[PDB]
């Protein structure tokens, strides 16, 4: 319970925030690439053209 509430674990966590957030962005861009969302792909300056 109280294993992850301390200064060492807090600074490990905030060291890992940029990597985990970048991995989340990778997952988001891969998922929208796989599923072809109109709501995202209609706003990028290139990929929106082929939907027409």
């Amino acid at each position: 319970l109280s294993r992850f509430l301390g200064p060492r674990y807090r600074e490990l966590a905030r060291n890992w925030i940029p990597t985990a957030g970048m991995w989340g962005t990778v997952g988001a861009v891969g998922l929208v690439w796989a599923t072809d969302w109109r709501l995202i792909l209609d706003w990028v300056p290139y990929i929106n053209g082929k939907f027409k």
Partner: protein, 445 residues
């Protein structure tokens, strides 16, 4: 008194330059004994594949007789004054040092000058020392960590003068003659590449006038107007595997390229090496050691020993680990050592950063305690840095190392780099270069 002002209160080292360019340095202490030595910029990095054993075989022939004292007269004088005479040779530095009382300083300085600039090479002594150096070569490769040391340097600095060993090969031992030894002595024993370093109960003006009396005008001339230069050495990521299953234990050393002597990141890498550390089977800490690699090894009974090393040479080096383990845990320790290295690369934590800083401070001061180690540090520092770095500056650098710059420098030197691997013994389970590389990077950063 506190640590910082105590380190300020450590006495400073007086450095002077003679007319020939030789650097006379000294540190005065309250001891009744002194340690006086000569450090020369000469070694395997200067030897050129035809006289590869010249410096080390001259180290053999240094104490066997000189012009002024032939035969055993010099040893008789050293024993009569009660001194201890020692020498060593590396890939870059060759040192001859004497431990004695303070009152025998003129005799020690005169003997050192006689060793340096008046060595006599009798042919019968050359043959006897050839037999001796062959026997000591057999004793050296009878030992096992030196074999992996030389193998790691060979596979790391292949094609360069840094790969070749200090003692050289046996064919060079058998074909080296007196003319090549004299050429090496007249080429690499110049005044501006020599430091006369004294430490302990030594008075600097007395040391300076003794150097002026005896040791002045060593050569001062290169007799060709040609000073040899050190080319940069290329480090190649590679592996060497000497499989011989009759040996009961396996020695594996994994390294990457070091920063160099004058690089500021050396202190940070020493902090990281203090964090990882060293261990052998005789340590009484048990499973409660702060080092994660040591704790894992002692919990799982993985290895007999491991160590971290940071060897530095002129703008190069070898930074890594060396472990002795049985044939059934080599892959385990490679995996755990790479995990610890990339843990420092990615998620270094301020608690063990401060722990490693304290360990490095204790290691530096505890090593520098002692007249012979502080004299060795003075000579090596004047040879490498061009100055003796004070303990105050060392502690200032250690204090300014924090966790962020630790993980930055560790990611610069360790993360995603091709290593040099040297395995000796039952190394069938030692993972190949592709698996070692895939341990040297992570897929989660």
């Amino acid at each position: 008194a506190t640590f910082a002002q105590a380190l300020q209160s450590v006495p400073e080292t007086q450095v002077s330059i003679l007319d020939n360019g030789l650097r006379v340095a000294s540190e005065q202490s309250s001891h009744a004994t002194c340690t006086v030595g000569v450090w020369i910029d000469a070694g395997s990095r200067y030897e050129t594949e035809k006289n590869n054993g010249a410096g080390y075989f001259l180290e053999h022939l240094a104490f066997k007789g000189t012009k002024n004292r032939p035969g055993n007269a010099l040893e008789k004088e050293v024993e009569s004054i009660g001194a201890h005479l020692n020498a060593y040779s590396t890939r870059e530095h060759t040192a001859y040092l004497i431990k004695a009382l303070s009152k025998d300083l003129p005799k020690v300085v005169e003997l050192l000058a006689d060793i340096v600039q008046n060595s006599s090479l009798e042919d019968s002594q050359i043959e006897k020392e050839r037999d001796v150096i062959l026997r000591e070569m057999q004793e050296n490769d009878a030992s096992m960590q030196n074999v992996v040391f030389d193998y790691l340097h060979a596979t790391a600095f292949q094609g360069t003068p840094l790969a070749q060993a200090v003692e050289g090969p046996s064919e060079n031992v058998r074909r080296l003659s007196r003319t090549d030894l004299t050429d090496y002595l007249n080429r690499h024993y110049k005044a501006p590449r020599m430091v006369l370093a004294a430490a302990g109960g030594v008075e600097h003006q007395q040391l300076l006038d003794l150097a002026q009396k005896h040791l002045s005008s060593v050569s001062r001339v290169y007799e060709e107007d040609a000073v040899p230069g050190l080319t940069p050495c290329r480090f190649t990521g590679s592996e060497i595997r000497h499989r011989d299953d009759a040996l009961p234990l396996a020695h594996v050393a994994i390294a990457v390229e070091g920063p160099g002597w004058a690089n500021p990141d050396n202190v940070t890498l020493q902090v990281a090496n203090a964090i990882i550390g060293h261990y052998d089977c005789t340590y009484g800490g048990g499973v409660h050691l702060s080092s994660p690699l040591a704790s894992v090894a002692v919990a799982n009974k993985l290895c007999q020993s491991f160590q971290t090393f940071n060897i530095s040479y002129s703008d190069t080096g070898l930074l890594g680990a060396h472990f002795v383990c049985d044939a059934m845990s080599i892959d385990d320790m490679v995996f755990f050592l790479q995990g610890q290295w990339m843990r420092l690369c990615t998620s270094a934590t301020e608690s063990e950063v401060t722990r490693g800083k304290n360990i490095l401070r204790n290691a530096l001061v505890s090593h520098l305690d002692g007249t012979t180690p502080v004299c060795e540090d003075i000579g090596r520092s004047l040879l490498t840095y061009g100055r003796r770095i004070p303990l105050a500056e060392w502690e200032s650098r250690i204090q300014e190392v924090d966790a962020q710059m630790l993980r930055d420098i560790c990611s610069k030197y360790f993360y995603d780099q091709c290593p040099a691997v040297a395995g000796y013994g039952p190394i069938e389970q030692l993972p190949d270069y592709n698996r070692i590389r895939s341990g040297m990077f992570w897929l989660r950063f």
